mmCIF file of C-alpha atoms in Angstrom:
data_model
loop_
_atom_site.group_PDB
_atom_site.id
_atom_site.type_symbol
_atom_site.label_atom_id
_atom_site.label_comp_id
_atom_site.label_asym_id
_atom_site.label_seq_id
_atom_site.Cartn_x
_atom_site.Cartn_y
_atom_site.Cartn_z
ATOM 1 C CA UNK A 1 5.063 -17.266 52.012
ATOM 2 C CA UNK A 2 4.781 -20.733 50.678
ATOM 3 C CA UNK A 3 3.056 -22.141 47.540
ATOM 4 C CA UNK A 4 0.256 -24.721 47.548
ATOM 5 C CA UNK A 5 0.895 -28.474 47.085
ATOM 6 C CA UNK A 6 -0.924 -30.602 44.452
ATOM 7 C CA UNK A 7 -2.115 -33.812 46.223
ATOM 8 C CA UNK A 8 -5.133 -32.910 48.430
ATOM 9 C CA UNK A 9 -8.296 -32.310 46.358
ATOM 10 C CA UNK A 10 -11.900 -33.387 45.665
ATOM 11 C CA UNK A 11 -14.303 -33.689 42.694
ATOM 12 C CA UNK A 12 -18.103 -33.251 42.728
ATOM 13 C CA UNK A 13 -19.608 -34.848 39.637
ATOM 14 C CA UNK A 14 -23.001 -36.255 40.698
ATOM 15 C CA UNK A 15 -21.609 -39.684 41.591
ATOM 16 C CA UNK A 16 -21.508 -41.463 44.958
ATOM 17 C CA UNK A 17 -17.732 -40.865 45.563
ATOM 18 C CA UNK A 18 -15.492 -37.761 45.359
ATOM 19 C CA UNK A 19 -12.037 -39.388 45.462
ATOM 20 C CA UNK A 20 -9.906 -39.544 42.320
ATOM 21 C CA UNK A 21 -6.388 -40.591 41.419
ATOM 22 C CA UNK A 22 -5.804 -38.047 38.669
ATOM 23 C CA UNK A 23 -7.378 -34.881 37.187
ATOM 24 C CA UNK A 24 -6.107 -33.062 34.055
ATOM 25 C CA UNK A 25 -7.029 -30.620 31.201
ATOM 26 C CA UNK A 26 -8.179 -27.443 33.041
ATOM 27 C CA UNK A 27 -7.095 -25.094 30.173
ATOM 28 C CA UNK A 28 -8.325 -21.854 28.491
ATOM 29 C CA UNK A 29 -7.370 -20.759 24.918
ATOM 30 C CA UNK A 30 -7.943 -17.824 22.496
ATOM 31 C CA UNK A 31 -7.269 -17.491 18.722
ATOM 32 C CA UNK A 32 -5.276 -14.662 17.119
ATOM 33 C CA UNK A 33 -6.247 -12.483 14.137
ATOM 34 C CA UNK A 34 -3.302 -10.843 12.301
ATOM 35 C CA UNK A 35 -3.163 -7.773 9.968
ATOM 36 C CA UNK A 36 -0.779 -5.524 7.929
ATOM 37 C CA UNK A 37 -1.527 -2.806 5.388
ATOM 38 C CA UNK A 38 1.073 -2.221 2.647
ATOM 39 C CA UNK A 39 2.044 1.344 3.615
ATOM 40 C CA UNK A 40 3.135 0.516 7.188
ATOM 41 C CA UNK A 41 6.788 1.418 8.203
ATOM 42 C CA UNK A 42 6.965 -1.843 10.151
ATOM 43 C CA UNK A 43 7.374 -5.137 8.373
ATOM 44 C CA UNK A 44 5.445 -7.244 10.873
ATOM 45 C CA UNK A 45 1.757 -7.688 11.758
ATOM 46 C CA UNK A 46 -0.614 -6.274 14.403
ATOM 47 C CA UNK A 47 -2.504 -8.787 16.551
ATOM 48 C CA UNK A 48 -5.981 -8.988 18.151
ATOM 49 C CA UNK A 49 -8.161 -11.667 19.949
ATOM 50 C CA UNK A 50 -10.385 -14.105 18.026
ATOM 51 C CA UNK A 51 -12.795 -16.893 19.070
ATOM 52 C CA UNK A 52 -12.382 -19.047 22.199
ATOM 53 C CA UNK A 53 -11.742 -22.758 22.953
ATOM 54 C CA UNK A 54 -11.797 -25.195 25.873
ATOM 55 C CA UNK A 55 -9.962 -28.511 26.399
ATOM 56 C CA UNK A 56 -11.540 -31.828 27.412
ATOM 57 C CA UNK A 57 -11.172 -32.957 31.042
ATOM 58 C CA UNK A 58 -9.736 -36.356 32.034
ATOM 59 C CA UNK A 59 -10.582 -38.141 35.310
ATOM 60 C CA UNK A 60 -8.887 -41.357 36.606
ATOM 61 C CA UNK A 61 -9.992 -43.658 39.505
ATOM 62 C CA UNK A 62 -9.436 -47.249 40.771
ATOM 63 C CA UNK A 63 -12.061 -49.955 40.033
ATOM 64 C CA UNK A 64 -14.177 -51.087 43.009
ATOM 65 C CA UNK A 65 -16.642 -53.899 43.611
ATOM 66 C CA UNK A 66 -20.262 -52.973 42.766
ATOM 67 C CA UNK A 67 -19.544 -49.414 41.495
ATOM 68 C CA UNK A 68 -20.573 -49.111 37.815
ATOM 69 C CA UNK A 69 -21.046 -45.282 37.660
ATOM 70 C CA UNK A 70 -18.773 -44.379 34.709
ATOM 71 C CA UNK A 71 -20.808 -46.771 32.609
ATOM 72 C CA UNK A 72 -24.195 -45.708 33.906
ATOM 73 C CA UNK A 73 -23.597 -42.016 33.100
ATOM 74 C CA UNK A 74 -22.238 -42.876 29.615
ATOM 75 C CA UNK A 75 -25.261 -45.078 28.983
ATOM 76 C CA UNK A 76 -27.632 -42.049 29.333
ATOM 77 C CA UNK A 77 -26.774 -41.035 25.711
ATOM 78 C CA UNK A 78 -29.797 -41.408 23.402
ATOM 79 C CA UNK A 79 -29.334 -40.144 19.784
ATOM 80 C CA UNK A 80 -28.668 -36.422 20.550
ATOM 81 C CA UNK A 81 -29.754 -36.472 24.290
ATOM 82 C CA UNK A 82 -27.498 -36.937 27.326
ATOM 83 C CA UNK A 83 -27.598 -36.094 31.017
ATOM 84 C CA UNK A 84 -25.510 -32.940 31.447
ATOM 85 C CA UNK A 85 -23.925 -32.072 34.791
ATOM 86 C CA UNK A 86 -22.249 -29.273 36.703
ATOM 87 C CA UNK A 87 -18.692 -30.309 37.591
ATOM 88 C CA UNK A 88 -16.921 -28.742 40.590
ATOM 89 C CA UNK A 89 -13.214 -29.329 41.209
ATOM 90 C CA UNK A 90 -11.543 -28.101 44.379
ATOM 91 C CA UNK A 91 -8.041 -27.860 45.911
ATOM 92 C CA UNK A 92 -8.201 -28.224 49.722
ATOM 93 C CA UNK A 93 -6.514 -26.792 52.868
ATOM 94 C CA UNK A 94 -5.569 -28.523 56.169
ATOM 95 C CA UNK A 95 -9.167 -28.223 57.476
ATOM 96 C CA UNK A 96 -10.318 -29.968 54.279
ATOM 97 C CA UNK A 97 -11.959 -26.738 53.006
ATOM 98 C CA UNK A 98 -11.723 -25.266 49.443
ATOM 99 C CA UNK A 99 -8.924 -22.884 48.503
ATOM 100 C CA UNK A 100 -9.000 -22.915 44.692
ATOM 101 C CA UNK A 101 -12.116 -23.860 42.740
ATOM 102 C CA UNK A 102 -12.616 -24.709 39.071
ATOM 103 C CA UNK A 103 -16.241 -24.415 37.951
ATOM 104 C CA UNK A 104 -17.292 -26.357 34.827
ATOM 105 C CA UNK A 105 -20.558 -25.880 32.874
ATOM 106 C CA UNK A 106 -22.636 -28.519 30.950
ATOM 107 C CA UNK A 107 -20.296 -31.579 31.055
ATOM 108 C CA UNK A 108 -21.022 -35.030 29.552
ATOM 109 C CA UNK A 109 -18.773 -38.051 28.641
ATOM 110 C CA UNK A 110 -17.103 -38.576 25.222
ATOM 111 C CA UNK A 111 -15.399 -41.757 26.249
ATOM 112 C CA UNK A 112 -14.985 -44.396 28.914
ATOM 113 C CA UNK A 113 -11.760 -46.488 28.952
ATOM 114 C CA UNK A 114 -11.371 -49.804 30.781
ATOM 115 C CA UNK A 115 -8.278 -51.531 32.205
ATOM 116 C CA UNK A 116 -5.881 -53.909 30.446
ATOM 117 C CA UNK A 117 -5.264 -57.386 31.936
ATOM 118 C CA UNK A 118 -1.858 -59.037 32.440
ATOM 119 C CA UNK A 119 -0.728 -62.396 33.871
ATOM 120 C CA UNK A 120 2.150 -60.691 35.693
ATOM 121 C CA UNK A 121 0.299 -57.394 36.182
ATOM 122 C CA UNK A 122 1.047 -56.783 39.846
ATOM 123 C CA UNK A 123 -0.913 -53.501 40.088
ATOM 124 C CA UNK A 124 -4.260 -51.712 40.601
ATOM 125 C CA UNK A 125 -6.889 -51.778 37.879
ATOM 126 C CA UNK A 126 -7.506 -48.096 36.874
ATOM 127 C CA UNK A 127 -10.474 -46.875 34.820
ATOM 128 C CA UNK A 128 -10.782 -43.456 33.158
ATOM 129 C CA UNK A 129 -13.231 -40.983 31.611
ATOM 130 C CA UNK A 130 -12.987 -38.030 29.181
ATOM 131 C CA UNK A 131 -15.469 -35.120 29.453
ATOM 132 C CA UNK A 132 -16.699 -32.446 27.037
ATOM 133 C CA UNK A 133 -17.941 -29.139 28.466
ATOM 134 C CA UNK A 134 -18.995 -25.578 27.592
ATOM 135 C CA UNK A 135 -16.956 -23.313 29.887
ATOM 136 C CA UNK A 136 -14.609 -22.821 32.830
ATOM 137 C CA UNK A 137 -14.430 -20.184 35.596
ATOM 138 C CA UNK A 138 -11.564 -20.022 38.123
ATOM 139 C CA UNK A 139 -12.132 -18.791 41.694
ATOM 140 C CA UNK A 140 -9.313 -17.981 44.142
ATOM 141 C CA UNK A 141 -10.173 -15.477 46.842
ATOM 142 C CA UNK B 1 25.826 -40.124 -23.174
ATOM 143 C CA UNK B 2 23.916 -37.687 -21.102
ATOM 144 C CA UNK B 3 21.095 -35.224 -21.988
ATOM 145 C CA UNK B 4 21.275 -31.443 -21.578
ATOM 146 C CA UNK B 5 19.895 -29.626 -18.494
ATOM 147 C CA UNK B 6 17.426 -26.690 -18.722
ATOM 148 C CA UNK B 7 18.733 -23.933 -16.367
ATOM 149 C CA UNK B 8 21.770 -22.270 -18.042
ATOM 150 C CA UNK B 9 20.739 -19.979 -20.932
ATOM 151 C CA UNK B 10 20.773 -16.425 -22.343
ATOM 152 C CA UNK B 11 18.511 -14.113 -24.403
ATOM 153 C CA UNK B 12 19.597 -11.385 -26.853
ATOM 154 C CA UNK B 13 16.726 -8.984 -27.457
ATOM 155 C CA UNK B 14 18.294 -5.530 -27.940
ATOM 156 C CA UNK B 15 18.073 -4.610 -24.251
ATOM 157 C CA UNK B 16 20.859 -3.868 -21.761
ATOM 158 C CA UNK B 17 20.598 -7.259 -19.915
ATOM 159 C CA UNK B 18 20.483 -10.901 -21.103
ATOM 160 C CA UNK B 19 19.367 -12.645 -17.892
ATOM 161 C CA UNK B 20 15.827 -13.990 -17.582
ATOM 162 C CA UNK B 21 13.867 -16.059 -15.098
ATOM 163 C CA UNK B 22 11.650 -17.855 -17.595
ATOM 164 C CA UNK B 23 11.307 -18.426 -21.370
ATOM 165 C CA UNK B 24 8.403 -20.296 -23.049
ATOM 166 C CA UNK B 25 6.449 -20.834 -26.341
ATOM 167 C CA UNK B 26 9.139 -22.003 -28.830
ATOM 168 C CA UNK B 27 6.644 -24.069 -30.936
ATOM 169 C CA UNK B 28 6.039 -24.940 -34.640
ATOM 170 C CA UNK B 29 2.650 -26.083 -36.080
ATOM 171 C CA UNK B 30 1.117 -27.231 -39.417
ATOM 172 C CA UNK B 31 -2.550 -27.673 -40.497
ATOM 173 C CA UNK B 32 -3.981 -30.845 -42.058
ATOM 174 C CA UNK B 33 -6.100 -31.175 -45.218
ATOM 175 C CA UNK B 34 -8.240 -34.357 -45.411
ATOM 176 C CA UNK B 35 -9.839 -36.155 -48.425
ATOM 177 C CA UNK B 36 -11.902 -39.248 -49.462
ATOM 178 C CA UNK B 37 -13.549 -40.116 -52.771
ATOM 179 C CA UNK B 38 -16.676 -42.313 -52.637
ATOM 180 C CA UNK B 39 -15.264 -45.326 -54.513
ATOM 181 C CA UNK B 40 -12.337 -45.960 -52.132
ATOM 182 C CA UNK B 41 -12.116 -49.471 -50.456
ATOM 183 C CA UNK B 42 -10.998 -47.776 -47.241
ATOM 184 C CA UNK B 43 -13.467 -45.954 -45.058
ATOM 185 C CA UNK B 44 -11.054 -43.343 -43.727
ATOM 186 C CA UNK B 45 -9.377 -40.229 -45.169
ATOM 187 C CA UNK B 46 -5.983 -39.424 -46.735
ATOM 188 C CA UNK B 47 -3.998 -36.567 -45.184
ATOM 189 C CA UNK B 48 -1.648 -33.825 -46.465
ATOM 190 C CA UNK B 49 0.046 -30.612 -45.063
ATOM 191 C CA UNK B 50 -1.715 -27.223 -45.054
ATOM 192 C CA UNK B 51 -0.697 -23.703 -43.935
ATOM 193 C CA UNK B 52 1.707 -22.960 -41.059
ATOM 194 C CA UNK B 53 1.484 -21.264 -37.621
ATOM 195 C CA UNK B 54 3.750 -19.961 -34.857
ATOM 196 C CA UNK B 55 3.094 -19.431 -31.125
ATOM 197 C CA UNK B 56 3.761 -16.244 -29.147
ATOM 198 C CA UNK B 57 6.862 -16.129 -26.920
ATOM 199 C CA UNK B 58 6.729 -15.267 -23.202
ATOM 200 C CA UNK B 59 9.667 -13.766 -21.265
ATOM 201 C CA UNK B 60 9.793 -13.247 -17.442
ATOM 202 C CA UNK B 61 12.335 -11.197 -15.377
ATOM 203 C CA UNK B 62 12.643 -9.547 -11.915
ATOM 204 C CA UNK B 63 12.047 -5.769 -11.546
ATOM 205 C CA UNK B 64 15.159 -3.641 -10.917
ATOM 206 C CA UNK B 65 15.767 -0.029 -9.951
ATOM 207 C CA UNK B 66 16.079 2.329 -12.954
ATOM 208 C CA UNK B 67 15.436 -0.306 -15.680
ATOM 209 C CA UNK B 68 12.283 0.606 -17.659
ATOM 210 C CA UNK B 69 13.052 -1.340 -20.905
ATOM 211 C CA UNK B 70 9.877 -3.455 -21.264
ATOM 212 C CA UNK B 71 7.910 -0.230 -21.240
ATOM 213 C CA UNK B 72 10.214 1.696 -23.534
ATOM 214 C CA UNK B 73 10.069 -0.962 -26.281
ATOM 215 C CA UNK B 74 6.253 -1.242 -25.974
ATOM 216 C CA UNK B 75 5.964 2.534 -26.181
ATOM 217 C CA UNK B 76 7.524 2.536 -29.714
ATOM 218 C CA UNK B 77 4.097 1.521 -31.163
ATOM 219 C CA UNK B 78 2.603 4.313 -33.304
ATOM 220 C CA UNK B 79 -0.669 3.457 -35.163
ATOM 221 C CA UNK B 80 0.659 0.606 -37.396
ATOM 222 C CA UNK B 81 4.457 1.202 -36.775
ATOM 223 C CA UNK B 82 6.658 -0.529 -34.191
ATOM 224 C CA UNK B 83 10.346 -1.249 -33.715
ATOM 225 C CA UNK B 84 10.879 -4.853 -34.825
ATOM 226 C CA UNK B 85 13.817 -6.891 -33.538
ATOM 227 C CA UNK B 86 15.781 -10.068 -34.133
ATOM 228 C CA UNK B 87 15.505 -12.313 -31.069
ATOM 229 C CA UNK B 88 18.216 -14.897 -30.324
ATOM 230 C CA UNK B 89 17.738 -17.514 -27.604
ATOM 231 C CA UNK B 90 20.567 -19.827 -26.599
ATOM 232 C CA UNK B 91 21.177 -22.856 -24.337
ATOM 233 C CA UNK B 92 24.742 -22.804 -22.934
ATOM 234 C CA UNK B 93 27.585 -25.251 -22.086
ATOM 235 C CA UNK B 94 30.105 -25.198 -19.181
ATOM 236 C CA UNK B 95 32.313 -22.642 -21.007
ATOM 237 C CA UNK B 96 29.221 -20.423 -21.333
ATOM 238 C CA UNK B 97 29.106 -20.997 -25.127
ATOM 239 C CA UNK B 98 25.987 -21.803 -27.257
ATOM 240 C CA UNK B 99 24.884 -25.390 -27.815
ATOM 241 C CA UNK B 100 21.296 -25.016 -29.046
ATOM 242 C CA UNK B 101 20.046 -21.830 -30.687
ATOM 243 C CA UNK B 102 16.529 -20.634 -31.485
ATOM 244 C CA UNK B 103 16.450 -17.865 -34.095
ATOM 245 C CA UNK B 104 13.361 -15.611 -34.190
ATOM 246 C CA UNK B 105 12.441 -13.172 -37.005
ATOM 247 C CA UNK B 106 10.601 -9.776 -36.759
ATOM 248 C CA UNK B 107 9.472 -9.766 -33.075
ATOM 249 C CA UNK B 108 7.517 -6.975 -31.318
ATOM 250 C CA UNK B 109 5.460 -6.839 -28.038
ATOM 251 C CA UNK B 110 1.697 -7.573 -27.790
ATOM 252 C CA UNK B 111 1.575 -7.060 -24.076
ATOM 253 C CA UNK B 112 3.438 -5.986 -20.977
ATOM 254 C CA UNK B 113 2.222 -7.260 -17.559
ATOM 255 C CA UNK B 114 3.163 -5.688 -14.221
ATOM 256 C CA UNK B 115 3.366 -7.189 -10.717
ATOM 257 C CA UNK B 116 0.601 -7.495 -8.115
ATOM 258 C CA UNK B 117 1.130 -5.981 -4.635
ATOM 259 C CA UNK B 118 0.401 -7.703 -1.305
ATOM 260 C CA UNK B 119 0.768 -6.659 2.352
ATOM 261 C CA UNK B 120 2.116 -10.111 3.238
ATOM 262 C CA UNK B 121 3.731 -10.696 -0.165
ATOM 263 C CA UNK B 122 7.132 -11.943 0.952
ATOM 264 C CA UNK B 123 8.538 -12.414 -2.579
ATOM 265 C CA UNK B 124 10.243 -10.900 -5.657
ATOM 266 C CA UNK B 125 8.324 -8.575 -7.943
ATOM 267 C CA UNK B 126 8.296 -10.253 -11.428
ATOM 268 C CA UNK B 127 7.361 -8.494 -14.676
ATOM 269 C CA UNK B 128 6.579 -10.205 -17.994
ATOM 270 C CA UNK B 129 6.252 -9.659 -21.749
ATOM 271 C CA UNK B 130 4.509 -11.461 -24.646
ATOM 272 C CA UNK B 131 5.998 -11.295 -28.175
ATOM 273 C CA UNK B 132 4.584 -11.766 -31.679
ATOM 274 C CA UNK B 133 6.936 -12.911 -34.450
ATOM 275 C CA UNK B 134 7.118 -14.180 -38.044
ATOM 276 C CA UNK B 135 9.241 -17.347 -37.906
ATOM 277 C CA UNK B 136 11.529 -19.727 -36.032
ATOM 278 C CA UNK B 137 14.646 -21.688 -37.069
ATOM 279 C CA UNK B 138 16.342 -24.246 -34.786
ATOM 280 C CA UNK B 139 20.115 -24.824 -34.909
ATOM 281 C CA UNK B 140 21.883 -27.731 -33.173
ATOM 282 C CA UNK B 141 25.171 -28.787 -34.710
#
């Protein structure tokens, strides 16, 4: 009778750790094609589905001693070659088991962003990555 | 101390209405005759006036219910006969009186062009006419 919360989750991306600070961009989108012939009694258009799009996925985590994984994956790019991975994102229950799963096909990294530095910057250094992919399936049983 | 504007005007052409959307082609042109005899110290030609020309005049208006005048005038053509008319074009002042007048002799229509139709054509249907004539006099007193 109650909705799910948004703070207990995990990400499987081929790296050593599965803990993240922030995950965003799990969207699906379709184009519209419009039409009207001149003899129609209505003065508006009829609509049908076009081609499909996906958004890029952003992942954020804190920087730790001796963990250089964002860089190492990015550095697998060689002219048109890159290591592609299966990305699995999951929202967890009180037993730490999956409830809602987002399945992502053929991901690789477009960009890796490092932290800024400040003399009075009393906070955690956070690094982030942006991923391209070829498709998303949502499972909730 | 100020020049005249270009949007307040009227056209008298023998039809029921005098309002138009657009008027163009009120031009005058003369040919040149060139000459040089071989003994001249200058290596260029002397110039004098030749024969004269006039341009065709274009008139544009919106289509209205039950007004078929462009067609009716055009349809007076019979082998080499046509109804010829005196065309008077005038630029108006704030009292709606003439300021600048263009006087055109012996006009008749070469062509009548109808509107295109479009399913998404959210605009006014505009018809146009092109006129031949035998002379133009400009009055500005």
